[PDB]
Amino acid sequence: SVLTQAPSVSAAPGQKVTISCSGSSSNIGNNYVSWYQQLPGTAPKLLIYDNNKRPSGIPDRFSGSKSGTSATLGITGLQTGDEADYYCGTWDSSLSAVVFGGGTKLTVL
Amino acid sequence: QCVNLTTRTQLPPAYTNSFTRGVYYPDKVFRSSVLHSTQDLFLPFFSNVTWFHAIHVSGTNGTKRFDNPVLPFNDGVYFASTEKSNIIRGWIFGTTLDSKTQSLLIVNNATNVVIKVCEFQFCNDPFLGVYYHKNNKSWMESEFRVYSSANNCTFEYVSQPFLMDLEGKQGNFKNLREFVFKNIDGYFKIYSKHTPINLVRDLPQGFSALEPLVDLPIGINITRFQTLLALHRSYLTPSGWTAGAAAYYVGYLQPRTFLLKYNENGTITDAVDCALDPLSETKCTLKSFTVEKGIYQTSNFRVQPT
Amino acid sequence: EVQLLEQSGAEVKKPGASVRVSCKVSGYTLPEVAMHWVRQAPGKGLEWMGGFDPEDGETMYAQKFQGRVTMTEDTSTDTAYMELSSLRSEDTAVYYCATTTPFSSSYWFDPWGQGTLVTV
Ligand SMILES: *[C@@H]1O[C@H](CO)[C@@H](O[C@@H]2O[C@H](CO)[C@@H](O)[C@H](O)[C@H]2NC(C)=O)[C@H](O)[C@H]1NC(C)=O
Ligand SMILES: *[C@@H]1O[C@H](CO)[C@@H](O)[C@H](O)[C@H]1NC(C)=O
């Protein structure tokens, strides 16, 4: 929507590569970031909240960071079942609402 | 409702010794600096009192232990707690702990305790649930996490809260709170007190006088009971339950003859049991707390038949 | 912790209609936790919707979609109805029932909603 991330990305299995989302000070700057996963026709699953907090049942192999308006979702230990789209979001005071990016569909090569 | 988490735990009940404790005023009559003697239900001094824990963290991480059993009433019941942060509200006193009998349901729901004598259905793991309403931003109390049905009710009453805080004290009080429950002659009477205690857990050597709160027509025999709890909900962290820690004291009453020393203002300090030891029974003969040097004849003894 | 009820069920309503969305819960009670809504169009991304505001205590409405969709709540039966109106071309899609926490900002939502497509 109002945020920046690519449609798709690809990498070899078992490797280490992350995905980032570029916001602004009006959105990511003062606000906490979340990340979500969905399989085709399934229930989008919360990945990481605040970029440092794993929900219950999340592999510890995921991390996160926020540098200025840029927020990277740490993705490590690629699995054959890790291919799916990951969504960035953070609170917006601009329209005073919840915003997301277009989504990035990972591919494990 | 009747949501339940038994979480049964092992280990022996941790006991203690009530030194001078559980002396209430067994009359309204104002007396001044006299030694009065009655034989009534009390908790006799130097008694075995079970320091129970409703919720008990034994540290590794978390590990909250919900142990609080249904407990028989027996002759009479004494109660004591500190609970700087209240987690305790009332007790379920009854017989069947079910329908077919009445039920004594004391809820000190903030701030108006609504004593209830009714017929309820008490769940297998009863306690008061507390949650957050989101409307008016107020923490409500779900009262049917205790009991499912409320009907047939015989009696209802409301008063100023027996449980009361002060706090701001970062401890050094603990606000030790005692409640005595005695069921006789159609009047089940409640007693109370509030005391500072600086000790880590157990009780001091001081005397605690408990006035009767309300003398109520109860007319039911209560042979068994359990306490009540206040817990809440948490949200995603690596549902939430067992707010803080909880522990309390329980002991059973018993007929004993006490000599009661009122003060100039009628505040009883020194009480002495007569049957406590062969020494204590003579002080009940002289009626005095001062025992002059000499020999005194205490009640006779008999050898009894095998 | 908690599993939820479905958002709708299967609601297929031909053009010239409008549809409520009633999302119930289990293991919690309705007004201890705030609900939320997100448009998800198949082969597309997330568009947030509805929602409750931890601040100010209001139930939010997405400004872009404001006024077309409304929400009500029955606290005891845990029924929260999301009524979308005035069907249009691109507005048939999965609209997820989601739930953050009123106590804090909690941008993080409930673990997942199962999703319901609508029809225009
Ligand atoms: C007090 O309640 C108890 C019920 O718990 C009644 O005591 C029972 O009496 C019968 C004899 O009629 C015994 O067989 C039961 O074992 C007793 N109950 C228990 C738990 O031991 C008693 O009737 C009630 N009090 C009065 C004064 O009637
Ligand atoms: C109290 O319990 C102790 C064990 O902790 C025991 O030695 C003592 O005899 C008991 N006394 C009474 C009066 O119950």
Numbering used by the authors:
A (entry chain C): 2 to 110
B (entry chain Q): 14 to 251, 256 to 323
C (entry chain L): 1 to 120
The authors write:
Spike (S) protein, the major protective antigen, utilizes its receptor-binding domain (RBD) to engage the host receptor ACE2 for viral entry into host cell.
Distinct from most structural studies of the apo SARS-CoV-2 S trimer in which multiple conformational states corresponding to 0–3 RBDs open were observed, only one conformational state was observed in the structures of S in complex with each two-antibody cocktail, which also differed from the structural insights gained from the SARS-CoV-2 S in complex with FC05 or H014 or P17 alone. FC05 recognizes an extremely variable patch on the NTD; none of the bound residues are conserved between SARS-CoV and SARS-CoV-2, explaining the virus-specific binding and neutralization activities of FC05. Contrarily, H014 targets a highly conserved epitope on the side of RBD and the epitope is only accessible when RBD is in the open state. Remarkably, FC05 and H014 adopt an interdigitated arrangement surrounding the exterior of the S trimer apex, which completely blocks the domain swapping between protomers and prevents the closure of RBD. It is worthy to note that the cocktail of FC05 and H014 represents a combination of two NAbs generated from two different approaches which confer potent neutralization activities against pan-SARS-CoVs. Furthermore, each of the two-antibody cocktail limits the conformational transitions of RBD, suggesting an additional benefit conferred during the cooperative neutralization carried out by the cocktail antibodies via interfering with viral membrane fusion. Footprint analysis of epitopes of these four NAbs suggests a partial overlap between H014 and HB27 epitopes, but no overlap between H014 and P17 or between HB27 and P17 epitopes. As expected, the binding of FC05 does not affect the attachment of any of the three RBD-specific NAbs to the SARS-CoV-2 S trimer, underlining the potential of these antibodies in formulating cooperative two-antibody cocktails as they bind simultaneously to distinct domains.
